[PDB]
């Protein structure tokens, strides 16, 4: 019913850039906050970035604050993460997920409600 | 990061508990400690949210709680298909939004 | 100088007398009607400043970018070589456009502040 | 839509049109009396927002907790399945209680701010 | 107590009833003129608070130092052993001086804030 | 004339909690700010916490900000410090004292005007 | 913390000075450097407050001053009963409210 | 046409103070922001302090924030830097310069437009 | 600080480039990277401001640009009198106003 599919690039060299986009279906995209979470090949999960439902207010983990841009287009049902510099430590499977925030008039979340399949970004 | 046991196991049908331990600025102060089950080769799915809440569609064998700075997930009636990497994720305020623990190989 | 003394001065110099004109904005049935209308005008201007998110300020910076089509003069040209009367005539046709944008900007800001406050 | 277009909409959607109704609040002796009373009403509402510590804001968050006795509906139920007319009727009997609490909250905040400022 | 109940109380205690008197400030041709003048007075006081940079506040701290010539009483003497009526008489002759300084202070603050905001 | 008497617990193990309360007499309790100061058995004095006269605004030293709660009841003339975790480094004689702050309409203090006898908290 | 001499002494009746040295962010910027006398087995009592002020009931033999980042307490007419651990306490702003020095054994 | 001349002291011992003043001519002093830049004898240039055109708003580099005071008198066309403590690392040629800031209604600078000859301050 | 080559040189008449490399929080984010020429024994004078702008009175042989976090000054037609210590200066926001690089001996 609810689906999220990540599409993006493959192998990037240090100092370059790569845009990763998550396409959503099966739910009202504009009604939920979206976030990106990554998993290094040999580690667990870590949070990368969070964007609210409107898209005007964003938050990042400090390690990517000057490198990654998160944006969304609620008419295209598309979430995009544009990454710069892309250091060797950034190799990971990146996932888009629904949840992580709620816009004051909605019940609290503070959890990631729905996950996509993920895409592997290799530096 | 949150601390989790590297590996947990038990006999089929046994109730097995996976703990997650943080500090007062995260697990302690905020009652938002979700749990995820990641099957090898698959994306994580949500198993527990808030502290005691279970998403619709999830079996009633998965439950948990929080005391002090320690949260736990208890899986009753352990099945062969429940062995997966489990993660805890705690809200840590506005400065640090989410902290994940190391995975536990059940 | 006093009330409107800066009217012929450059836009920059006149910004230091904003309080003087402000004080002079508020300072038989037809006369009573005139006083009532003066009060309504004053309140309309105060309400408009409230909507834009300025409230009790005489100088208020905003988040609306300059279009460059409204006026393409240099910043120093506008502030050092023009009076406010000339400027008001120069951009009269764009006044309502600017006002509309200011209202929209504040509405988005208020929602973002509310959602920022909602974070535990 | 325009003035009161959101009257039948849910509480959430109507919050995006707060400026439209606000603009339309201010917009022979009996007619002059009516204008004077409209001005006094407007000022009473503005004074009340001032006392609560909101001033020039259309959306103002406060420090007064919800009692749960005033209304025990879910947050999503109130914002997604009710109009403002229904809500106003639902909590009419508690309006003055809420207003009293808001006034007290601001008074404590002002004293705490003053004492915080007093620290060298 | 209610309206003006604190009139005979010390300056300190009466600061906790500032909202009560404020509410009672706003609450045939001659009667209509009286209402219009009451509105103009109220707005003049609100405009004056706006100019000073206080806006919707009942207690407002400023950056103007006390001259010591206006009054040389101890801080505890003024706040614990005097009423507001006595204080108002004691510094009546310096009221306009203080008001002038407050206006100038806010003007400098506004320019400094604008220039601080201008930094990229 | 003026008296402050500390009452509280004795020996606590790490990870527990202990509430220490100071009873005041001989002066108007609600007219003065109150604070807690501690002295380790072999060291000098250090400031722990400060509460104003009303009780709504509090300050703490960073080492106890997430562990200690300071509160007062001006009708009961009672100052209470509720301590959690209580690490070995927290063993000390704790004192309550009058002073340390003044509520804007009062002459400046920035000193501790009156001290109690103290109570020893052992971890 | 503020620096104080570990031990100070002198002949009875002699004027003896106990110094306290801080930095510009504390003793220098704020003229609030109080002094306390702690008798062994007793709670500290206030001896000096602000910079030059003496509480009522305190003998006029205890006085002090401040210069640069150094504050001092001078005890004239030293008595046998004046030997106690003396402490300086400086206001250090809103971020750090009070800083105490090490005690001086007189 | 445009001139800036630094006048000040010579050799100072640690713990003392020294006032350095820059006299301006050939331009309207009150129309430009002023700043101080120093060059250690064997190093390059570093920024020390910045004052706006009015003189009410000032900025400093962290290493001198608690030691140096920058002020200007627009009627005397004089820029003054009063330095305290003056550590061995403060030996340098100090220069006054026009530029570094613009008061919102002026075109951007963010550069130092005009430099004086400099004066050597030795600790 | 910004990184500059310790020494740069070339034949008279040759176009010689002096680079300056910073990070994203300074050269990258803000297009305010000025260049100064300091003759031995003289105060620095402004050669380039903003990114591509040249002050009036400066020869058209001095020009420059910015790409990524690297800024550069190119001096065409090198003259004997152009050998001086060159510095780059970048705006780094409100917290750090200006950062200078090490000098390059041309
Ligand atoms: C009028 O214009 C002249 C132009 O030379 C200017 O010098 C003068 O100050 C102006 N006076 C005003 C605006 O009062
Ligand atoms: C400038 O105004 C025109 C309409 O006249 C508009 O199409 C254009 O997008 C505006 N520019 C910006 C930057 O918004
Ligand atoms: C405006 O600035 C441009 C440079 O961007 C310049 O060429 C032009 O002459 C300036 N005009 C005025 C009136 O200052
Ligand atoms: C406004 O529009 C009218 C249309 O006739 C035009 O004549 C006038 O010059 C315009 N004014 C400005 C300032 O663009
Ligand atoms: C009226 O109610 C219906 C309910 O199905 C809703 O779809 C529609 O948008 C509402 N229209 C309004 C509030 O204008
Ligand atoms: C709710 O209201 C009742 C009075 O109707 C009051 O007694 C109770 O304390 C209120 N609850 C809270 C949490 O204040
Ligand atoms: C309100 O939330 C509770 C859970 O706390 C749930 O059981 C109930 O059905 C909800 N009601 C509505 C109308 O959403
Ligand atoms: C308000 O009180 C009256 C008392 O008669 C009651 O009939 C009415 O239903 C109450 N309304 C609400 C919203 O509680
Ligand atoms: C009136 O003055 C007396 C003085 O002893 C005081 O105790 C009392 O509280 C005052 N009452 C007021 C101000 O209402
Ligand atoms: C006090 O007022 C007098 C004028 O009566 C003035 O000359 C003096 O400078 C004032 N003091 C201060 C500190 O401003
Ligand atoms: C005011 O304070 C001074 C000390 O600065 C004191 O000598 C005087 O007695 C005080 N007066 C009152 C009325 O408190
Ligand atoms: C104000 O000035 C008049 C001058 O006659 C004097 O009589 C009166 O006492 C003064 N009042 C104050 C409070 O200084």
Would you put residue H119 in left (φ > 0), alpha (ψ -120 to 50) or beta? beta
* Cα Rg of chain A, angstroms: 14
Give the closest ligand to the alpha carbon of residue E92: 12
CA end-to-end span of chain C, whole Å? Answer: 53
Query: From the CB of E77, is ligand 11 less than 6 Å away?
Result: yes
Partnered with residue G49 across adjacent β-strands are G53
CA distance I35 to I50: 9
Q: Is H27 exposed, middle or buried (0-12, 13-18, 19+ CB in 10 A)?
A: middle
Question: Taking Cα atoms as reference points, which of F45, F43, F57, F37 lies closest to residue F99?
Answer: F37
Sign of the CA dihedral I3, I5, I7, I12?
negative
Give the CA distances from residue A93 to residues A35, A40, A117, B62, in Å, rounded to whole numbers and listed in that order.
Answer: 14, 6, 9, 27
Question: Taking Cα atoms as reference points, which of D37, D34, D100 lies closest to residue E26?
Answer: D37
Nearest to E32 among D32, D51, D53 (CB): D32
Q: At B96, is the secondary structure helix, strand, or coil?
A: strand
CA distance C111 to A56: 10
Angle of CA points B30, F47, G103, to nearest 5°: 150
CA count, 13 A, side-chain hemisphere, H97 = 27
- F neighbour chains, 3+ CB pairs within 8 Å: B, D, E, G
Q: At C28, is the secondary structure helix, strand, or coil?
A: coil
Asked if A103 and D76 touch (Cβ cutoff 8 Å), the reply is no
Partnered with residue H59 across adjacent β-strands are H50
CA distance A123 to A91: 6
Q: How many domains does one find in chain F?
A: 1
Closest-CA residue, ligand 1 atom 8, reads C9
Measured from CB, residues less than 6 Å from any atom of ligand 7 are D 74, 76-77
The DSSP call for residue I54 is -
Closest-CA residue, ligand 6 atom 8, reads D67
Per DSSP bridges, beta strands A68-73 and F45-51 are unpaired
Question: Domain containing F116: what range?
Answer: 3-123
Angle between helices C29-51 and D29-51 (to 10 degrees): 30
Asked if B88 and B73 touch (Cβ cutoff 8 Å), the reply is yes
Partnered with residue E100 across adjacent β-strands are none
**Closest CA of chain I from E116, distance in Å:** 9
CA distance I101 to I106: 14
CA distance A35 to B44: 14
Q: Is D32 exposed, middle or buried (0-12, 13-18, 19+ CB in 10 A)?
A: middle
Angle between helices C29-51 and D18-26 (to 10 degrees): 160
Concatenate the DSSP letters of all residues of E22-39 into one string: HHHHH--HHHHHHHHHHH
- Greatest CA separation for chain F: 43
Concatenate the DSSP letters of all residues of H32-64 into one string: S-EEEEEE-TTS-EEEEEEE-SSSS-EEE-GGG
Give the closest ligand to the alpha carbon of residue D89: 8
CATH, residue H22: 2.60.40.10
CA distance F104 to D105: 19
- The torsion defined by the Cα of F77, F82, F86 and F90, in degrees rounded to 10, comes to -30
Sign of the CA dihedral I9, I11, I12, I14?
negative
The DSSP call for residue C15 is G
- Minimum-distance ligand 12 atom for the alpha carbon of E90: 13
Nearest CA in chain H to G29: H66
Q: At D39, is the secondary structure helix, strand, or coil?
A: helix
The DSSP call for residue G24 is I
- Interface check for D12 against chain A (CB to CB < 8 A): the answer is yes
CA distance C38 to E44: 13
Partnered with residue F39 across adjacent β-strands are F45, F93
Task: Find the D106 Cα to ligand 6 centroid distance in Å.
Answer: 19
Distance of CA B84 to the CA centre of its chain: 12
CA distance C117 to A99: 18
**Closest CA of chain A from B18, distance in Å:** 16
Question: Domain containing G31: what range?
Answer: 1-106
- Interface check for A66 against chain I (CB to CB < 8 A): the answer is yes
Contact H113 I46 (CB under 8 A): yes
Which strand ranges, in their side-by-side order, compose the sheet holding F68-73? F3-8, F17-25, F78-84, F68-73
Q: At I31, is the secondary structure helix, strand, or coil?
A: coil
Closest-CA residue, ligand 1 atom 3, reads C9
CA distance G47 to G72: 12
Sign of the CA dihedral D41, D43, D47, D53?
positive
Asked if A95 and B43 touch (Cβ cutoff 8 Å), the reply is yes
Partnered with residue A28 across adjacent β-strands are none
CA distance B84 to B44: 10
- List for chain B the helix, strand, coil content (%; round to 5): 10, 45, 45
CA distance I102 to H46: 10
Query: From the CB of E96, is ligand 12 less than 6 Å away?
Result: no
The DSSP call for residue D65 is P
Closest-CA residue, ligand 7 atom 6, reads D74
* φ, ψ at E58 (rounded to 5°): -95, -25
> Which of the residues D108, D112, D115, D119 would you substitute to probe the F interface, choosing the one with the greatest number of F C-beta atoms within 10 Å?
D115
Q: How many domains does one find in chain G?
A: 1
CA distance D63 to D105: 7
Question: Taking Cα atoms as reference points, which of G66, G70, G94 lies closest to residue G2?
Answer: G70
CA distance D90 to D94: 9
Q: Which residues contact H116 (CB under 8 A, 6 or more apart)?
A: H3, H4, H5, H6, H22, H95, H96, H97, I43
Q: Which residues of chain B does C119 touch, with a Cβ-Cβ cutoff of 8 Å?
A: 94
- Minimum-distance ligand 11 atom for the alpha carbon of E76: 14
Ligand 8 pocket test, candidate residues D93, D94, D96, D98, most atoms within 8 A of CB: D93
Closest-CA residue, ligand 4 atom 6, reads C93
Question: Which residues 5-64 of F have a C-beta within 8 angstroms of E?
Answer: none
Q: Which alpha helices (DSSP H) does chain B contain, by range?
A: none
- Interface check for A62 against chain I (CB to CB < 8 A): the answer is no
- Interface check for C35 against chain E (CB to CB < 8 A): the answer is yes
Question: Taking Cα atoms as reference points, which of H74, H73, H71 lies closest to residue H60?
Answer: H71
- Interface check for D120 against chain F (CB to CB < 8 A): the answer is yes
Give the count of beta carbons closer than 10 Å to the beta carbon of residue A77.
Answer: 16
Task: Find the F28 Cα to ligand 9 centroid distance in Å.
Answer: 17
- State yes or no: chains A and C have 3 or more CB pairs below 8 A: yes
CA distance A39 to C86: 61
Instruction: Annotate chain A with three-state secondary structure.
Output: CCEEEEEECCECCCCCEEEEEEEEECCCHHHCCEEEEEECCCCCEEEEEEECCCCCCEEECHHHCCCEEEEEECCCCEEEEEEECCCHHHCEEEEEEEECCCCCCCCCCCCEEEECCCEEEEC
The DSSP call for residue D19 is H
Query: From the CB of D69, is ligand 6 less than 6 Å away?
Result: yes
**Closest CA of chain H from G43, distance in Å:** 36
Give the count of beta carbons closer than 10 Å to the beta carbon of residue I75.
Answer: 24
Q: Which residues of chain F does B24 touch, with a Cβ-Cβ cutoff of 8 Å?
A: 66-67, 85
Query: From the CB of D10, is ligand 5 less than 6 Å away?
Result: no
> What resolution in Å is listed for this PDB structure?
3.4
Question: Which residues 42-61 of D have a C-beta within 8 angstroms of E?
Answer: 43-44, 47, 49-51, 53-56
**Closest CA of chain A from B95, distance in Å:** 9
Asked if A70 and A51 touch (Cβ cutoff 8 Å), the reply is yes
Asked if H11 and H119 touch (Cβ cutoff 8 Å), the reply is no
Nearest CA in chain E to C17: E107
Q: At I14, is the secondary structure helix, strand, or coil?
A: coil
CA distance D42 to B18: 60
Question: Taking Cα atoms as reference points, which of F10, F64, F54, F60 lies closest to residue F33?
Answer: F54
CA distance H30 to H4: 14
Contact D58 C114 (CB under 8 A): no
Question: Taking Cα atoms as reference points, which of I5, I16, I18 lies closest to residue I80?
Answer: I16
Give the CA distances from residue I48 to residues B34, D36, I77, I90, I96, in Å, rounded to whole numbers and listed in that order.
Answer: 56, 64, 17, 11, 21
Each as own residue / partner, the long-range contacts of residues I5-14 (CB below 8 Å, 24 or more positions apart, any chain) are: I5/I104, I6/I102, I6/I104, I6/I105, I7/I104, I7/I105, I7/I106, I8/I104, I8/I105, I8/I106, I9/I83, I9/I106, I10/I78, I11/I78, I12/I78, I12/I79, I12/I80, I13/I77, I13/I78, I14/I78
Containing E44, the helix (H) or strand (E) segment is: helix E29-51
> Experimental technique used?
cryo-EM
Distance of CA E53 to the CA centre of its chain: 12
Concatenate the DSSP letters of all residues of G30-60 into one string: ---EEEEEE-TTS--EEEEBTTTB--TTS-T
Closest-CA residue, ligand 10 atom 4, reads E69
CA distance C19 to C3: 9
Per DSSP bridges, beta strands B62-67 and B45-48 are unpaired
Q: At I35, is the secondary structure helix, strand, or coil?
A: strand
Asked if A122 and A91 touch (Cβ cutoff 8 Å), the reply is yes
The DSSP call for residue C1 is -
Asked if H115 and H97 touch (Cβ cutoff 8 Å), the reply is yes
* φ, ψ at I51 (rounded to 5°): -115, -45
Question: Taking Cα atoms as reference points, which of I41, I31, I45, I13 lies closest to residue I92?
Answer: I31
Q: Which residues of chain G does F61 touch, with a Cβ-Cβ cutoff of 8 Å?
A: 97
Nearest to H107 among C12, C15, C75 (CB): C75
Task: Find the E76 Cα to ligand 11 centroid distance in Å.
Answer: 9
Task: Find the C87 Cα to ligand 1 centroid distance in Å.
Answer: 17
- Interface check for C61 against chain A (CB to CB < 8 A): the answer is no
Q: Which residues contact D67 (CB under 8 A, 6 or more apart)?
A: D94
Q: Is F4 exposed, middle or buried (0-12, 13-18, 19+ CB in 10 A)?
A: buried
The DSSP call for residue E45 is H
* C80-106 exposure pattern, b = at least 16 Cβ within 10 A, e = fewer: eeebeeeeeeeeeeeeeeeeebbbebb
Give the count of beta carbons closer than 10 Å to the beta carbon of residue B6.
Answer: 8
* φ, ψ at E115 (rounded to 5°): -75, -30
CA distance D3 to D5: 5
CA distance I90 to I100: 7
- Minimum-distance ligand 11 atom for the alpha carbon of E77: 13
* φ, ψ at E24 (rounded to 5°): -90, 5
Q: Which alpha helices (DSSP H) does C1-120 contain, by range?
A: 11-14, 18-26, 29-51, 75-81, 84-90, 95-117
């Amino acid at each position: 019913e609810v689906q999220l599919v990540e599409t993006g690039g493959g192998l990037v060299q240090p100092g370059g850039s790569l845009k990763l986009s998550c396409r959503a279906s099966g739910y009202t995209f504009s009604s939920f906050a979206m976030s990106w979470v990554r998993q290094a090949p040999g580690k667990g999960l870590e949070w990368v970035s969070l964007i609210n439902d409107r898209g005007g207010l964003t938050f990042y983990v400090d390690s990517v604050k000057g490198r990654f841009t998160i944006s969304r287009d609620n008419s295209k049902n598309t979430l995009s993460l544009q990454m710069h510099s892309l250091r060797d430590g950034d190799t990971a499977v990146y996932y888009c997920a629904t949840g992580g925030m709620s816009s004051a008039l909605q019940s609290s979340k503070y959890y990631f409600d729905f996950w996509g399949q993920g895409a592997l970004v290799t530096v | 990061a949150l601390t989790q046991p590297p590996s947990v196991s038990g006999s089929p049908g046994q109730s097995v508990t996976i703990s997650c331990t943080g500090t007062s600025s995260d697990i302690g102060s905020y009652n938002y400690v979700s749990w995820y089950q990641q099957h090898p080769g698959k994306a994580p799915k949500l198993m527990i949210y808030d502290v005691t809440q279970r998403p619709s569609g999830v079996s009633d064998r998965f439950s948990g709680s929080k005391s002090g700075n320690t949260a736990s997930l208890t899986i009753s009636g352990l099945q062969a298909d429940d062995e997966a990497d489990y993660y805890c994720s705690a809200y840590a305020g506005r400065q640090t939004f989410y902290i994940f623990g190391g995975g536990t190989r059940l | 100088d006093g009330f409107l003394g800066a009217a012929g001065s450059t836009m920059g110099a006149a910004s230091m007398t904003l309080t003087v004109q402000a004080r002079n904005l508020l300072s038989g049935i037809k006369q009573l009607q005139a006083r009532v209308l003066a009060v309504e005008h004053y309140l309309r201007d105060q309400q408009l400043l409230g909507i834009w998110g300025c409230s009790g300020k005489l100088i208020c910076c905003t988040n609306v970018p300059w279009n460059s089509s409204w006026s393409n003069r240099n910043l120093s040209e506008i502030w050092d070589n023009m009076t406010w009367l000339q400027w008001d005539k120069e951009i009269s046709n764009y006044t309502q456009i600017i006002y509309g944008l200011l209202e929209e900007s504040q509405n988005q800001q208020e929602k973002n502040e509310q959602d920022l406050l909602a974070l535990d």
